[PDB]
């Protein structure tokens, strides 16, 4: 069904849409700037409208790696490194890998949201794998090693899988499998309802990023409304937007994402092809 493909395309393109939109106001304190509603580009990097950042770049790298050779963390890092060296915590991980050959180069200080911003591709291709959560943890470990970042990635992997399978918003927010689970205290507070309150800003800390995305998803009645709530929190807006985009994209579907946002999106067609290829792979 196109209905099923629509969810996978939505999750992938939603990630990029959130990255591009949020990038326009990243670094700005909440409530100090005009409400973001359109793909105008700009931000600290004077981005053209619809242009995303490293969040989506890493997602693309992971997607190509998966389609090229299944789950291969070594290949993932080869691609990240190559992407990194072609341009001018993660950089430390990439250099660690370059020097030692260890693909799981993340350290305990890496509690950032990097693993969350690029996740979608993994779930699209390995949605039905019995070890999906373990694969997600390994995919996070390549650049981040903090307990809360690894667990936050597992929670997002579960969320995406369930959304792709048609689980209702209430079930996704209930996070039943994680209730009472032995998680890092910060993440436990999120799973137990910390996300119902509006964040003071878009957090860069993994648990906080997930909480901000869940909050926007909980309050937004559709993809667009939730996306605007997410990015207007300011702070790490491109990444909070990217995480929200993945969840909301999988939940609402590509057809629910504002057409003008998709038409302005850089490499829209390339991503749609990748998303479809990954989905075919999961079957």
Residues in binding site for Mg(2+): 26, 53-55, 236, 238-239
Structural contact between residues 12 and 280, judged by C-beta atoms closer than 8 angstroms: no
- Both tokens of 114, joined, read 């990097």
In terms of CB distance, is 76 or 113 closer to Gd ion?
113
- Both tokens of 142, joined, read 């390549």
In terms of CB distance, is 114 or 253 closer to Gd ion?
114
User: How far apart, in whole angstroms, are the C-alpha atoms of residue 277 and residue 212?
Assistant: 30
Of the candidate spans 47-55, 78-86, 145-153, 213-221, the one that interacts with Gd ion by CB under 5 A turns out to be 47-55
| Least separation in angstroms between CB 155 and Gd ion | 19
Pick from 57, 232, 239, 246 the residue near Gd ion by CB under 5 A.
239
Pick from 13, 47, 51, 54 the residue near Gd ion by CB under 5 A.
54
In degrees, rounded to 5, the angle at the alpha carbon of residue 45 between the alpha carbons of residues 44 and 50 is 110
Of the candidate spans 77-85, 212-220, 239-247, 254-262, the one that interacts with Gd ion by CB under 5 A turns out to be 239-247
| Least separation in angstroms between CB 91 and Gd ion | 13
What CA–CA distances, in Å, run from 5 to 158, 165, 167, 249? 18, 11, 16, 11
238 binds Gd ion (CB under 5 A): yes
CA dihedral 24, 228, 232, 32 (to 10 degrees): 90
20 binds Gd ion (CB under 5 A): no
Neighbours of 170 (CB within 10 A): 8
In total, the chain counts a number of residues equal to 283
| Least separation in angstroms between CB 19 and Gd ion | 7
Q: Does residue 112 sit in helix, strand or coil? A: strand
Nearest partner of 168 among 53, 251, 79, 270, judged by Cα: 251
Q: Build a one-symbol-per-residue string for 123-162: x at contacts with Gd ion by CB under 5 A, - elsewhere.
A: ----------------------------------------
245 binds Gd ion (CB under 5 A): no
Residues contributing to the annotated binding site:
26, 53-55, 236, 238-239
User: How far apart, in whole angstroms, are the C-alpha atoms of residue 214 and residue 16?
Assistant: 18
Pick from 24, 53, 143, 246 the residue near Gd ion by CB under 5 A.
53
| Least separation in angstroms between CB 10 and Gd ion | 21
CA dihedral 32, 33, 35, 41 (to 10 degrees): -150
Q: Does residue 279 sit in helix, strand or coil? A: helix
236 binds Gd ion (CB under 5 A): yes
212 binds Gd ion (CB under 5 A): no
Site of interaction with Gd ion (CB under 5 A): 53-55, 236, 238-239
């Amino acid at each position: 069904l196109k209905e099923r493909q629509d969810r996978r395309l939505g999750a992938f393109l939603g990630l990029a849409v959130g990255d591009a939109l949020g990038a326009q106001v990243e670094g700005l304190p909440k409530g100090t700037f005009p409400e973001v509603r359109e793909m105008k580009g700009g931000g600290p990097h004077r981005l053209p409208p619809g242009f995303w950042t490293d969040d989506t770049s890493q997602a693309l790298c992971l997607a190509e790696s998966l389609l090229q050779r299944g789950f291969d963390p070594k290949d993932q890092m080869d691609r990240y490194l190559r992407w990194y060296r072609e341009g001018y915590a993660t950089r430390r991980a990439l250099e660690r890998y370059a020097a030692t050959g260890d693909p799981y180069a993340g350290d305990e200080a890496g509690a950032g949201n990097g693993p969350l911003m690029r996740l979608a591709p993994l779930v699209l291709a390995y949605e039905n794998h019995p070890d999906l959560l373990s694969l997600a943890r390994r995919a996070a470990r390549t650049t981040h090693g903090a307990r809360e970042a690894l667990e936050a990635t597992e929670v997002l992997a579960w969320l995406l899988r369930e959304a792709l399978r048609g689980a209702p918003k209430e079930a996704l927010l209930a996070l039943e499998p994680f209730r009472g689970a032995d998680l890092h205290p910060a993440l436990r507070r999120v799973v137990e309802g910390g996300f119902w309150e509006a964040p003071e800003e878009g957090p860069g800390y993994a648990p906080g990023t997930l909480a901000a995305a869940l909050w926007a998803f909980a309050r937004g009645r559709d993809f667009e409304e939730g996306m605007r709530l997410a990015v207007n929190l300011g702070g790490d807006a491109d990444t909070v937007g990217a995480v929200y985009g993945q969840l909301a994209g999988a939940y609402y579907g590509l057809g629910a994402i504002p057409g003008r946002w998709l038409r302005a999106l850089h490499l829209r067609e390339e991503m749609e092809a990748l998303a479809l290829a990954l989905y075919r792979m999961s079957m």
